[PDB]
Design a protein around this ligand. Sequence first.
Ligand SMILES: OC[C@H]1O[C@@H]2O[C@H]3[C@H](O)[C@@H](O)[C@@H](O[C@H]4[C@H](O)[C@@H](O)[C@@H](O[C@H]5[C@H](O)[C@@H](O)[C@@H](O[C@H]6[C@H](O)[C@@H](O)[C@@H](O[C@H]7[C@H](O)[C@@H](O)[C@@H](O[C@H]1[C@H](O)[C@H]2O)O[C@@H]7CO)O[C@@H]6CO)O[C@@H]5CO)O[C@@H]4CO)O[C@@H]3CO
Length: 476
Amino acid sequence: KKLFLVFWWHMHQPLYREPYTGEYLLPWTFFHAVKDYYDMPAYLKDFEIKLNFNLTPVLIDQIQEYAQGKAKDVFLEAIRKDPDDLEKEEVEKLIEFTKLNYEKPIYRFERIRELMNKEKLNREELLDLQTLNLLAWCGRTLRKDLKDLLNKGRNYTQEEKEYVLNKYFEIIKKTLSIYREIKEEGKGSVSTSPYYHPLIPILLNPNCVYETTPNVKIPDFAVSFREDASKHVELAKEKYFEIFGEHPVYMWPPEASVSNEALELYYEKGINMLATDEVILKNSVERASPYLRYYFRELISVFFRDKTLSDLIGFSYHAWNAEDAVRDFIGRLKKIHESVDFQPVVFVVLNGENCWEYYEENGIPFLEKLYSTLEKEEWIETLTLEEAMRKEDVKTEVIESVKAGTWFDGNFLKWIGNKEKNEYWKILIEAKKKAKNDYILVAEGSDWFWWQGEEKAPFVEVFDKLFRSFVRRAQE
Ligand SMILES: OC[C@H]1O[C@@H]2O[C@H]3[C@H](O)[C@@H](O)[C@@H](O[C@H]4[C@H](O)[C@@H](O)[C@@H](O[C@H]5[C@H](O)[C@@H](O)[C@@H](O[C@H]6[C@H](O)[C@@H](O)[C@@H](O[C@H]7[C@H](O)[C@@H](O)[C@@H](O[C@H]1[C@H](O)[C@H]2O)O[C@@H]7CO)O[C@@H]6CO)O[C@@H]5CO)O[C@@H]4CO)O[C@@H]3CO
């Protein structure tokens, strides 16, 4: 009797490319590509397990632009330039980026503490600031290849910085190839999401928010977004087809968000399986175990992720010693394995790129320990999404209805319902009345709605500029 374990790492970035200037206004796609988007599947070169990945189409677009050398990234230019060539504004951007990342373990360089305590930085000090910002985001592969430059920790030259930059772009250029390879070799399945990561249930029926939060205020949805919901799905199928040669059979619904209407739409567009959140299951069925394969109306297969295990990795274990965290995770799997008569299916689903910057050494001790341990536990079998979808010796259940929601507490309050988030929806609704091109789809991404109210969110002025620029461009 085995326990079936399914990792599904979700990779996504909103479009940071300003449509009028073509400039990438934030470097987050660059830094997560060099740190995470190649290196997370690249663990499969060293560990004999299965790991699955979701890539959103808008992320794939940006990875391609960087790999082709076409991305004009404003923060990266401030890093690349000889400090003598820096604008005052670029020096300011470098310093503020450092300040906003200073406390993360991946920024744990003595030289950074030195530089940030200096009243004034000369050329050699700025060169170190530039190069250490680059190296702070170094991924697992290049942390070994560039270990000597990392251990320097200071006194970098322009040549050395340029060497690191070239190696970083090599990693980006190999990134889509590694997803194809692990897919073709059967080491993992690759899924995608509706194109710009929107909240499909709201686009189909904004009143679905009242299924869980009756007291929320929402704006007057005076236009229909139902066709756009279809377009997000169809365009995502086409993008995946371009990259991998086949249409996608699995999708990750953004924010784990489902509803009866959304599940019907995924079915109608030919999607065979998705996953969503355990809280949705609890809200939808009086007594239900998350370790079964569910069939929604016999139309589409649904797995509900194990929220505790997913949250332990995403939120908890950065604060633990790495062996203890792995011991805790395996011990929880042991309890699941011993608690049921059948073979349970355990979905661990979370973002694959955002938690590691808070772990010691970029989560590498944790993941190397975890994967090394997993491959040696005879009673755990890790599965691709394909294997989980088709596995015969598991328990199944049919369900007829779900209560619409997301993995945020089973509801939509992270993106709608306060005065400021609703203002953005009003802007989008009014722009949709006059939209003439697919930039209105870009503006429907969930990324433009989560930060309104999150005191503590860095660069919200840039997100506001991007959203409003996409909305204006959509009407031309
Ligand atoms: O929009 C920019 C953002 O885009 C993508 O993130 C998506 C993500 O792909 C979606 O799945 C979803 O994420 C969930 C998270 O899974 C969930 O954990 C939670 O996220 C909260 C964090 O846990 C919490 O720590 C805090 O986030 C901080 C974050 O720690 C800071 O580092 C900083 O985030 C910046 C990122 O560093 C930067 O890479 C980029 O983020 C991308 C992200 O990489 C990409 O995957 O920009 C952000 C902002 O500058 O600040 C934040 C805020 O203080 O709070 C978050 C949100 O509550 O919930 C989200 C939403 O359900 O959605 C995100 C965002 O759309």
